[PDB]
Design a protein around this ligand. Structure first.
Ligand SMILES: *Cc1cc2c(cc1C)nc1c(=O)[nH]c(=O)nc-1n2C[C@H](O)[C@H](O)[C@H](O)COP(=O)(O)OP(=O)(O)OC[C@H]1O[C@@H](n2cnc3c(N)ncnc32)[C@H](O)[C@@H]1O
Ligand SMILES: O=C(O)c1ccccn1
Length: 393
């Protein structure tokens, strides 16, 4: 049985950012990853992630401002720009309300916060970005500071930095049980056992599997989302992240999005996806890894009709898992299990969120909680929410 100050369950971006932060502070840390480092079977897949500036939630705006300098610090340390401003384009029916929000209302928020943006007509959208056949009444805005994040460069950066700082990184090892006590946490995996001062759970949608035997369960939902890669057919001037807000159809939400071009790449492929209604999974093992045929046909058919700058026959389709608070008024679960179980303060938990954009900050916070029980950042609104009735002392 090996001893560590911190054992991180999960080797995705959050786990690696946490390990790096803990190791650089001089503590003994072990990262246990069930599959391989850089795997694409969890919530982290593909080459890119979006980081918009426009929000109607004050929380997200604040998280964005606090994370920016941490990305700059990471970019400096790994000698790689990871965030690229390519723009964030929201267009279509400006009043339809969707899980992504509403254009008009978000535009009003930007007005209030002095967030700059250009308002565009259907004609402007087609001319500048190559969309075609759009209803003449579609409008939207382009927020020019919207960015796209280099996913693989970020993971390489975190892995190498954590390793250089002394973290022990182990793959192909599944944590099966955690038992916290007053002096630390006993960790069992399919390969051995370990003792930890504290454990950080950054295991994607699997958090509840390890909390269940301890009498805890968080209120988050897991969704298997479809994603397709397409070949760029025509070179273009501008290629921002885009989201098409449309009125729903009897069969689906009729919402689609594209991540935009990847500046660090040869510019050969881009990824797009449907933002359709999907029923949560009962357990992540229910995920199939097979993109839903109808959704892919709908997405490809829409690109064929409205974005001829790409070959609408996908080169590859796959899935990615989203883990989000079940209650839409909550966006992230990040704190300890202190209010959920005895000795819960010894389990630091990152349990839900649409958060690649906040990886540097969440890693720092998890590190703070694991090494000091407190963080300078206010995480009161990120409290992990229980899915069970509150009966504990
Ligand atoms: C799926 C998805 C997510 C997403 C997105 C689009 C899609 C289709 N677009 C985003 C965007 O534009 N901007 C943004 O900020 N976020 C966006 N997201 C969300 C983002 O991808 C996720 O928030 C992020 O990937 C989460 O990272 P995290 O590190 O928390 O989790 P993960 O990569 O799933 O990794 C968890 C690791 O844990 C391992 N694991 C699981 N169970 C165990 C056990 N028992 N033992 C050991 N290891 C375990 C997994 O294998 C995984 O590697
Ligand atoms: O607004 C976002 O962050 C978003 C929405 C849909 C797909 C990817 N990213």
């Amino acid at each position: 049985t090996e001893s560590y100050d911190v054992v991180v369950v999960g080797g995705g971006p959050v786990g690696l950012a946490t390990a790096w932060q803990v190791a650089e502070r001089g503590h003994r840390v072990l990262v246990l990853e069930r599959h391989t480092f850089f795997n694409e079977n969890g919530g982290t897949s593909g080459a890119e992630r979006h980081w918009r500036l426009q929000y109607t939630q004050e929380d997200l705006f604040r998280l964005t401002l606090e994370t920016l300098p941490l990305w700059r610090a990471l970019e400096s340390r790994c000698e790689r720009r990871l965030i690229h401003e390519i723009g964030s384009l929201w267009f279509g029916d400006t009043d339809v309300v969707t899980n992504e929000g509403q254009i008009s209302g978000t535009a009003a928020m930007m007005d209030k916060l002095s967030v700059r943006y250009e308002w565009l007509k259907a004609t402007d959208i087609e001319r500048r970005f190559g969309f075609r056949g759009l209803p003449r009444d579609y409008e939207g805005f382009l927020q020019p500071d919207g960015g796209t994040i280099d996913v693989r460069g970020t993971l390489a950066a975190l892995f190498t930095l954590a390793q250089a700082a002394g973290a022990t990184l182990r793959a192909g090892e599944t944590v099966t049980e955690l038992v916290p006590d007053a002096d630390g946490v006993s960790v069992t995996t399919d390969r051995g056992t370990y003792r930890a001062g504290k454990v950080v759970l950054a295991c994607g949608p699997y958090t509840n599997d390890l909390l269940e035997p301890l009498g805890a369960r968080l209120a988050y939902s897991v969704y298997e989302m479809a994603i397709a890669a397409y070949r760029q057919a025509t070179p273009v001037t501008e290629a921002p992240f885009w989201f098409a807000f449309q009125q729903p159809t009897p069969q689906d939400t009729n919402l689609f999005y594209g991540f935009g071009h990847n500046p660090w790449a040869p510019g050969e492929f881009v990824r797009c996806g449907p933002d359709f209604e999907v029923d949560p999974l009962d357990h992540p093992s229910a995920a199939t890894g097979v993109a839903d045929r109808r959704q892919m046909d709908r997405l490809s058919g829409w690109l064929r009709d409205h974005l001829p700058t790409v070959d609408p026959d996908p080169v590859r389709t796959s899935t990615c898992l989203a883990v989000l608070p079940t209650d839409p008024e909550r966006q992230f679960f990040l704190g300890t299990a202190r209010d959920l179980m005895t000795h819960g303060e010894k389990l630091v938990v990152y349990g839900a969120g649409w958060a690649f954009k906040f990886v540097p900050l969440f890693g720092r916070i998890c590190a703070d909680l694991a090494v000091e029980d407190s963080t300078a950042y206010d995480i009161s609104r990120l409290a992990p929410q229980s899915a069970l009735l509150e009966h504990h002392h």
